[PDB]
């Protein structure tokens, strides 16, 4: 039983701790496959011709594509999608005409939302789960973090059951089941995690897509932050203590309140690192300042916030890239990796999943520290005319 | 049915709107008394020798004190106190030796707390409400706000119910009843408020253990007033802590903060918070205030403004020269209360609160505006070198 953290690193990002490159891990996954692959992906932009192609950064992507064909040359790719982005792409059509069984859940139909989950279960015995969705930009042109597990076959299905929840929906005239039978019921929640020298469990969201025995991603995040007693390391591309894309906008403090409660009532030192990528919302910035203002070393309250700005350089060719897509958190006890950002939708409307495991915590510790003391992480007052994010 | 708001203004200067002086209105109240007065007070220190300071501003204080004897010379005074402050004062003994019935509720024994309520019900038909407890400093050397009601008796017994709760727990070895009988039950809560003056009004008590059936707790009253707000919220409390106080394990407490920010964000409500600054205030309060001020973003229709009210000393008189007033008003209603905004006042410490709606709400509007757009109110980033408040 092995679990490895995987990291996708674009141009730059220099003696520092490092993780295993994600592209080799994906080649890894497609190589070990002997029987079947099950895919949950937000969108599919893997070939390049779907978007501008003259960057030459694309190979890591379509080389990966050929590996897919190998599984279809060896005789079952099972993909699931959403009210998808990059509709011009023909990857799913190619794989369906080549032998892959694909249905898309129109999550907007059911809960106004989207399928933001991105995970793999291969041969029923290996799993991948992380922030890297189906995109070559997620392989070479955006920072990504994830985790992959092999051998542990008795836990490998533990995300398949969710994958299968997604599978049952998306059929024509599909309806939300008010109760999932024992087939989709889970036995690996927060109360009883896995065993083997770590312990781990998965979580799904939203509640309507959570069968019995499934802990919600919100509850997993809250429990991980509550169990923290010295530090809370959070890295999400966007952080909004508010609901998004809801006709009446409403405040949403539960995550924020838990952060501040950990900082104050238990003296936990908390640092929050959020991404800036030319597409972020400037309205996000005041809330971060509202957290940063809590800092007071004389009262044992330690709240520090920074923004991770990655430079576009000569690569303005790629439009939806040059961000920190990684989403994770670590406390001295546990390590949570997630697919969802920190806003109301991911816990009320849009599908998402999250793993939490318990040296791996120290590995992610040093990953975050390298991503935090770095030169691309800047404080709130560092306007920096040469920096390339929108702040107002 | 008449209601007048009363304001105590020390040696300071406000052409500005004004309210009825508190000392003369209080003397009025003791004059109108014919049968009985019931007093709930935090402490009793009205003479100079009560705290041993030789200031002639105390005379008005002792003037009121002398009036008490007249009422007891006219044949009745009933007072209830707490694990009280200024224990050197002998006022309660003086009134007791002349015919006043006094018992002390040992609120520290029962609910961790103190009796912070300050109100009068006189003749069962006139009432006083305010932040001004029994202190001559509250008559001449500290900013105070309150409200008095005449000829509207149907609310006077509703406050007599809470007074009688205090009375019954004032007996020796008294224990909190898990159920208050129908005698203490109230019929004038927020859901059915009251109906001279074309107004509607109601009272609220705290903590829950001292709230009989039909009584809304002050927490719910504040939350309802902020929730019903649609265009603005004026808040003025001497101290504002989104945290517990005097609580052995400190924990965060976001309930009022969440509302203030939920009102600001989800409904575009303009929010201004005015807190008192004195030589004894807690510097740790300031970061949390920034957490509100950082919310400000005119581009997103969120309006959060904070200032601090500092009155200059000139001190000889100890534990004075502050803004001890606590109230809030929205374009619909006006709540004035006896408790500051921190967890204790809504879980442990006794407090009461009036809220009325219909010109009185507009009266409080421009009263606060005279205090906000004012001379003694300064922003967080000012911290002028010469005034007498603690910032670090």
UniProtKB/Swiss-Prot annotation, chain A:
- Keyword Nuclease listed: yes
State the activity regulation.
Answer: The exonuclease activity toward ssDNA substrate is Ca(2+) and Mg(2+)-independent, but it is inhibited by Fe(2+), Cu(2+) and to a lesser extent Zn(2+) ions.
Q: Which GO terms describe its cellular component?
A: early endosome; endoplasmic reticulum; endoplasmic reticulum membrane; lysosome; nucleus; phagocytic vesicle; trans-Golgi network membrane
- Keywords assigned by UniProt, alphabetized: Cytoplasmic vesicle, Disulfide bond, Endoplasmic reticulum, Endosome, Exonuclease, Glycoprotein, Golgi apparatus, Hydrolase, Immunity, Inflammatory response, Innate immunity, Lipid metabolism, Lysosome, Membrane, Nuclease, Nucleus, Phospholipid metabolism, Repeat, Signal-anchor, Transmembrane, Transmembrane helix
Outcome recorded upon mutating residue 137 to Q: Tends to form aggregates. Loss of exonuclease activity toward ssDNA substrate
Q: Tell me what happens on changing residue 332 to A.
A: Loss of (S,S)-BMP synthase activity. No effect on protein expression or localization to lysosomes. Loss of protein stability
- What is the enzyme's main class? hydrolase
What is annotated as the active site?
Answer: 116 (proton donor), 118, 123, 325 (nucleophile)
Reported tissue expression: Expressed in plasmacytoid dendritic cells and monocytes (at protein level).
Effect caused by changing residue 384 to V: No effect on exonuclease activity toward ssDNA substrate
Membrane topology field: Single-pass type II membrane protein
- From the UniProt record, give one GO term of the biological process aspect: phagocytosis
Q: How is it modified after translation?
A: Highly N-glycosylated.
Give the domain of life. Eukaryota
The domain-related comment in the record is: The catalytic domain contains two conserved PLD phosphodiesterase HxK(x4)D(E) motifs that accomodate the phosphate group of the nucleic acid substrates, with one nucleophile histidine residue forming a phosphohistidine intermediate and the other histidine protonating the leaving 5'-OH ssDNA/RNA fragment, resulting in the cleavage of the phosphodiester bond. The homodimer has two independent catalytic domains arranged at the dimer interface.
Family, as annotated: Belongs to the phospholipase D family.
What quaternary arrangement does the UniProt entry report? Homodimer.
Q: Say what the protein does.
A: 5'->3' exonuclease that hydrolyzes the phosphodiester bond of single-stranded DNA (ssDNA) and RNA molecules to form nucleoside 3'-monophosphates and 5'-end 5'-hydroxy deoxyribonucleotide/ribonucleotide fragments. Partially redundant with PLD3, can cleave all four nucleotides displaying higher efficiency for ssDNA and RNA fragments initiated with uridine and guanosine residues and lower efficiency for cytidine-initiated substrates.
> Under which name does UniProt file this protein?
5'-3' exonuclease PLD4
Species whose genome carries this gene? Homo sapiens (Human)
Span within the parent record: 94 to 505 of 506
From Swiss-Prot, chain B:
GO cellular component terms, semicolon-separated: early endosome; endoplasmic reticulum; endoplasmic reticulum membrane; lysosome; nucleus; phagocytic vesicle; trans-Golgi network membrane
Sorted alphabetically, the keyword list is: Cytoplasmic vesicle, Disulfide bond, Endoplasmic reticulum, Endosome, Exonuclease, Glycoprotein, Golgi apparatus, Hydrolase, Immunity, Inflammatory response, Innate immunity, Lipid metabolism, Lysosome, Membrane, Nuclease, Nucleus, Phospholipid metabolism, Repeat, Signal-anchor, Transmembrane, Transmembrane helix
List the expressing tissues: Expressed in plasmacytoid dendritic cells and monocytes (at protein level).
**Subcellular location, in the record's words?**
Endoplasmic reticulum membrane; Golgi apparatus, trans-Golgi network membrane; Nucleus; Early endosome
UniProt signal peptide? none
One GO term of the biological process aspect: innate immune response
The active site lies at 116 (proton donor), 118, 123, 324 (nucleophile)
pH-dependence of activity, as noted: Optimally active at acidic pHs.
UniProt similarity note:
Belongs to the phospholipase D family.
Name-wise, this protein is: 5'-3' exonuclease PLD4
